[PDB]
Amino acid sequence: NINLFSSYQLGELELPNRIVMAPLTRSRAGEGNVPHQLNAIYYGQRASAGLIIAEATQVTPQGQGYPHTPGIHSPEQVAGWKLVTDTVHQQGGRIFLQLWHVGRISHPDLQPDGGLPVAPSAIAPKGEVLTYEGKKPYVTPRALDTSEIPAIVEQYRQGAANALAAGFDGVEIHAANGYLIDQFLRDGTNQRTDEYGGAIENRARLLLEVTEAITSVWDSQRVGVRLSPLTTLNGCVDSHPLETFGYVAQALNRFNLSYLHIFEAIDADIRHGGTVVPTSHLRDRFTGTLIVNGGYTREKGDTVIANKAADLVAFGTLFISNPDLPERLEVNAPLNQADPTTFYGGGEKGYTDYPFL
Ligand SMILES: Cc1cc2nc3c(=O)[nH]c(=O)nc-3n(C[C@H](O)[C@H](O)[C@H](O)COP(=O)(O)O)c2cc1C
């Protein structure tokens, strides 16, 4: 009778419970997009998680899309992240870094030399993007040349190598929420006519090449992949999500990965006649560890573990406000209410000052 509090063997790591801290952008990086002591305190406070997945962290300068997110491309960033991994390990926790490239979801003001964001296809996102000077309209990204795809893969490989030097326990490839890899996956954002567009094997190719490069740096059971099959975030939608995401789930088996992590869009059920990609479909086609996420509670997490629908359950919002979420869920304590006004940017307030039980 396994439940959220059951231990789990994730490759060589023994997780003390099945509760994962989802990756959460908090936009509190210092100069040079470098993590600092306050970020180490924040993650250390949450080290009772079975596994922490750190916030999305750009693998290269062009992969930044929002002010003050941390990177994993410079020696100063590695040193700052080692403060974080040192603290988490001292607290007896485990932490993976989520490796990011935002693709088109950026602005020239955040790019080297004020250049265009890059993407599979030159299709502007709708609406506005935050810059240092304030909100501005998006521009149209540059479509990468076929010859530049190896450079993207190499940027991910280097980000993964830097994460290894920073003392992480593993890495998660951010292939969700409409960022660069997801832009290639989904046909709403990828109109390419080379071997990276069109057929599903072509749209999946960037993710698979990135995965192969990263599993050349890390043992493969320390590499996870995140997908979000039915999100509409960032204007990124696929026309045949069951076929697309079911193909990816099966295609990842041969890499012997740490896990596949699914963020189940919060409106998946109401935004269709029903969910067009039940997670069961992905559970059936990926044979490894499955993390599920999106609106989970103690009740719902225990149910999915008991029914064998998932192995691990990641919590986002609740881990912002409850540093000791595992203990609170275990003893059925009150939960602190998250304050969205301090999710992104700032200092201690709404970051390290949510109380323990
Ligand atoms: C403030 C905030 C920042 C987030 N940043 C990231 C991120 O860096 N990477 C990611 O893959 N998802 C990110 N997400 C999505 C969360 O990981 C999670 O999937 C989502 O909030 C749903 O889970 P929940 O209902 O447990 O919060 C973020 C969500 C929030 C609320």
Residue numbers in the entry: 14 to 370
Source paper text:
To generalize this engineering approach for crystal contacts, a non-ADH-homologous enzyme was selected to apply the established strategies to the Nostoc sp. PCC 1720 ene reductase (NostocER). As OYEs are strongly dependent on cost-intensive NADPH as a cofactor, Mähler et al. engineered NADH-accepting variants (NostocER1) by exchanging NostocER loop regions at cofactor-binding sites to ER loop regions from Achromobacter sp. JA81 and Acaryochloris marina with a higher NADH affinity. For this study, the NostocER1 Loop1,5 variant (NostocER1-L1,5) was selected as an example protein for the rational introduction of Lys–Glu interactions at crystal contacts to demonstrate the impact of rational single amino acid exchanges on the crystallizability of proteins and enhance protein crystallization.
Out of the crystallization conditions resulting in crystals within two days, the following were selected based on cost efficiency and compatibility for customers and the environment: 25 mM Tris–HCl, 0.1 M NH4Cl, 5 mM CaCl2·2H2O, 50–150 g L−1 PEG 6000, pH 8.5. Based on the observed intermolecular crystal contacts, nine amino acids were selected for NspER1-L1,5 mutation. They were selected based on their distance to a potential intermolecular interaction partner at the crystal contact of <6 Å (except for Q263K). Exemplarily, the NspER1-L1,5 crystal contact at positions 204 and 350–353 is depicted below, with mutations Q204K and Q350K/D352K/T354K generated in silico and the distance between the potential interacting amino acid residues E89 and E25/27, respectively, calculated using PyMOL (v.2.3). However, for the NspER1-L1,5 WT, no crystals were visible with the Tris buffer, and a lower number of larger crystals (compared to mutant Q204K) grew with the HEPES buffer. Contrary to the Q204K mutant, the addition of PEG 6000 did not initiate the NspER1-L1,5 WT crystallization in a stirred 5 mL crystallizer. In accordance with the protein concentration measurements, no crystals were observed in the crystallization samples of the NspER1-L1,5 WT after 20.5 h of crystallization.
